[PDB]
Amino acid sequence: MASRILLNNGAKMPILGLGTWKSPPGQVTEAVKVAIDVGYRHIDCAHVYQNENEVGVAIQEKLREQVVKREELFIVSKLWCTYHEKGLVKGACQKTLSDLKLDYLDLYLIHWPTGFKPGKEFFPLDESGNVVPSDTNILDTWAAMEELVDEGLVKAIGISNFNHLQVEMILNKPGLKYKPAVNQIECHPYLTQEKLIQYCQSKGIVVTAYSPLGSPDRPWAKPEDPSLLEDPRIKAIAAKHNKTTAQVLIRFPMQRNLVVIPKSVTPERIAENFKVFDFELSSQDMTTLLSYNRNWRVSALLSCTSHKDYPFHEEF
Ligand SMILES: NC(=O)c1ccc[n+]([C@@H]2O[C@H](COP(=O)([O-])OP(=O)(O)OC[C@H]3O[C@@H](n4cnc5c(N)ncnc54)[C@H](OP(=O)(O)O)[C@@H]3O)[C@@H](O)[C@H]2O)c1
């Protein structure tokens, strides 16, 4: 198991990163410091997580302590939906760079394919509860992202929550300058993503698996929802390998040549989640975990099902 994967920009990306969505501002600085101490070299961030300043403080402390050099870190962030207008993309990136206290990002993603009306509200809604769209499209927003690479603000650009038709639109864009490096998508045993992974990997696009533990802290969880960490079938596979259910869920995508970004703010779990290079799931284990697929998404952007660019009407 190589600890990094080669991107189509020539850079290497660590296959394990720390997620930061729902990491409260007062706890994320310690989380990132512990992660870097433990050995994490990849942090997944976003403007919309409202904690990038605190992530920046942690990275800076570790650079000053000389625990790591900047070139050893792989820092990812994402353009929020209210900044898809071509003229707003650079300013949004630079706000992220300022909060993170960085000269550049290793990777900058279009967070969702759906552009929203600009403003301070992250989700500008109509009276029916549906998001108010912006007059934007995927290709124009991509062109603006490419300019960030040209000016050296980011080393790579990619996408998140794009379906294969949306990826294909970018790959076929007239005058394309940079292919997406990464498509970051929800992926775990209940949403195995076989067709989209096959597609992306066939095009040389690296897939990052988000919510690998099933996002048990998501604010909208309902009692009827299935729970990966509580699934006795996955607990049994963990028992067999003398590992935790979380460790099995992290190793699973690694063996599919995916990058994976489990989130924690608990120091003990941050350390536990990194101890996944000392075992291997069997061929049968992988087939078994894949068989648990039930097309179940924790992250379905339900306020946007009538948006022109809603990604999840398509099969994949
Ligand atoms: N591109 C996108 O649209 C998108 C969408 C969703 C997520 N993401 C990214 O992917 C990351 C991961 O997804 P996620 O945050 O939804 O959820 P996740 O990583 O699947 O699960 C996080 C939850 O699991 C708990 N946990 C972590 N390690 C554990 C362990 N070893 N044992 C027991 N519980 C454990 C955490 O608790 P504590 O933190 O309290 O320890 C938290 O409640 C995000 O943080 C974000 O960076 C991106």
* CATH code for the domain in which residue 285 is found: 3.20.20.100
Q: Which DSSP letter does residue 205 get?
A: P
**List of residues 6+ apart from 13 with CB closer than 8 A:** 4, 5, 6, 7, 42, 74, 106, 107, 182, 206, 259
Dihedral angle, C-alpha 28, 33, 35, 36, nearest 10 °:
140
Which residue stretches of the chain are H helix?
25-38, 52-64, 89-100, 138-150, 164-171, 194-202, 232-240, 245-254, 267-274, 283-290
Given a contact cutoff of 8 angstroms between Cβ atoms, the answer to whether 2 and 277 are in contact is: no
Please report the resolution in angstroms.
1.5
| 19 phi, psi to nearest 5 deg | -80, 155
Q: Which residues is 160 bridged to in the sheet?
A: 184
Which helix (H) or strand (E) element contains residue 5?
strand 4-6
d(CA 20, CA 260): 13
Give the number of domains in the chain.
Answer: 1
d(CA 15, CA 60): 22
Mutate which of 215, 247, 303 for ligand 1? The one with the most ligand atoms within 8 Å of its CB, which is 215
DSSP 266-279: -HHHHHHHH--SS-
**Which is it for the CA torsion 11, 15, 18, 19, positive or negative?**
positive
Q: Is the CB of 96 under 6 A from ligand 1?
A: no
Identify the burial level of 109 via C-beta atoms within 10 angstroms of its C-beta, where 0-12 means exposed, 13-18 middle and 19 or more buried.
buried
Q: What is the CA radius of gyration of the chain?
A: 19
Given a contact cutoff of 8 angstroms between Cβ atoms, the answer to whether 156 and 110 are in contact is: no
Specify the amino acid at residue 220. Answer: W
Nearest to 133 by CA among 112, 154, 152: 112
Q: Is the CB of 20 under 6 A from ligand 1?
A: yes
d(CA 159, CA 157): 7
d(CA 185, CA 196): 9
Residue 315 lies in domain: 1-316
Please state, in angstroms and as integers, the Cα–Cα distance from residue 241 to each residue in 8, 236, 237, 249, 254, following that order: 34, 9, 7, 12, 16
To the question of whether residue 136 is assigned a binding role by annotation, the answer is: no
Please state, in angstroms and as integers, the Cα–Cα distance from residue 120 to each residue in 22, 109, 116, 123, following that order: 19, 20, 11, 9
Dihedral angle, C-alpha 229, 235, 238, 243, nearest 10 °:
60
